[PDB]
Amino acid sequence: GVRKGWHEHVTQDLRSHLVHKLVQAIFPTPDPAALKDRRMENLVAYAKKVEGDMYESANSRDEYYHLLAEKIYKIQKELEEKRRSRL
């Protein structure tokens, strides 16, 4: 019947741009060798599972843009703690 003003500004392509931000959090810097790494295989599928969970969290394209920052933000700084996990 009806639905939130969701699709208004998410679009199919424009939405793909946001998905990359989720993957950049775990790996901001470029890594041509990572693409060959089996670990990367999980990165894609992983983001695909969470992204769907991140998108739904928003009842509007606006909220979706905010929650996205928190995820990438927390994960962005979290990378620092992971480095000291072995020193």
Partner: peptide, 19 residues
């Protein structure tokens, strides 16, 4: 729905090792 993330820590560990 969801729970604790295990691979999430392994994914970051990969990038954490290199630059």
């Amino acid at each position: 729905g969801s729970g604790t993330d295990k691979e999430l820590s392994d994914l970051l560990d990969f990038s954490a090792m290199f630059s």
